[PDB]
Amino acid sequence: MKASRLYTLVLVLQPQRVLLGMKKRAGRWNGFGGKVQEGETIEDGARRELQEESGLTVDALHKVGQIVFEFVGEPELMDVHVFCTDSIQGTPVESDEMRPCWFQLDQIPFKDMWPDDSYWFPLLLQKKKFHGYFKFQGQDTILDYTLREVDTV
Ligand SMILES: Nc1[nH]c(=O)nc2c1ncn2[C@H]1C[C@H](O)[C@@H](COP(=O)(O)OP(=O)(O)OP(=O)(O)O)O1
Ligand code: NA
Ligand code: NA
Ligand code: NA
């Protein structure tokens, strides 16, 4: 059995568009998030990372999924808690590491996203909740995965 490290992932999903961030320093679009820190709830860590990485604040988030990632050659699992919100305060801000961009929901840039997103982001769009697991060789190749719609995350 492996140890896991906690991470967050936040999708700013509006009725016609989604906000993603491009990793600059790279080339992949993703939600916003990072490692949960000592002492904070997972939801508060998600809000903190959204603000640190995009400039956006939100009063609250909705938890929509949990995904565990395993990478060949890495002993630690990434336990990613996935949140959405439709309600935002301020404008997204580009940094040296991340460039935010809105995409229309008929132009979701799946080929330039993590490959797993093609499987779970459709569920998120349908207001479904999910649990997933994906094993990767490097950045591009999935060797094994499981995905399940759930009623409670
Ligand atoms: N396969 C995958 N699919 C996906 O959609 N998001 C993934 C993913 N693998 C990792 N992520 C997300 C999870 C989390 O939001 C982020 C990884 O966290 P980071 O290493 O960026 O955390 P930190 O911001 O704490 O790190 P530093 O900025 O290096 O301190 O990438
Ligand atoms: Na971060
Ligand atoms: Na961080
Ligand atoms: Na991050």
83 in ligand 1 pocket by Cβ < 6 Å?
no
Other beta carbons less than 10 A from residue 78's beta carbon: 17
CB proximity list for 45: less than 8 A, separation 6 or greater: 6, 8, 34, 35, 36, 37
Distance between start and end Cα atoms, the chain: 22
- Rounded to 5°, the CA angle 144-7-64 comes to 75
**How many Å lie between the centroid of ligand 1 and the Cα of residue 128?**
22
69 in ligand 1 pocket by Cβ < 6 Å?
yes
Collapsed DSSP state (helix, strand, coil) of residue 127: coil
33 in ligand 1 pocket by Cβ < 6 Å?
yes
Residue whose C-alpha is closest to residue 80's, from 120, 111, 28, 51 = 120
Q: Tokens for 145, please give them.
A: 């995965």
Q: Is the Cβ–Cβ distance between 103 and 13 less than 8 Å? A: no
70 in ligand 1 pocket by Cβ < 6 Å?
no
80 in ligand 1 pocket by Cβ < 6 Å?
yes
Collapsed DSSP state (helix, strand, coil) of residue 42: helix
**How many Å lie between the centroid of ligand 2 and the Cα of residue 38?**
14
From 35, 54, 64, 140, mutation site for ligand 1 pocket: most ligand atoms within 8 A of C-beta: 35
Alpha-carbon gap, residue 21 to 97, rounded angstroms: 9
Resolution stated for this PDB structure, in Å: 1.2
Domain region containing 135: 1-153
**Which run of H or of E encompasses 50?**
helix 42-54
Query: Which technique was used to obtain these atomic coordinates?
Result: X-ray
Query: Which residue spans within 24-140 are E strands per DSSP?
Result: 29-30, 62-71, 77-85, 98-104, 129-137
Q: Is the Cβ–Cβ distance between 51 and 116 less than 8 Å? A: no
DSSP strand pairing (62-71 vs 4-13): unpaired
Kindly report the protein residue whose alpha carbon is nearest to atom 28 of ligand 1: 34
Residues linked to residue 68 through DSSP beta bridges, in sequence order: 79, 133
CA distances from 63 to 31, 41, 136 (A): 14, 12, 24
Q: Which amino acid is at 153?
A: V
Total domain count, the chain: 1
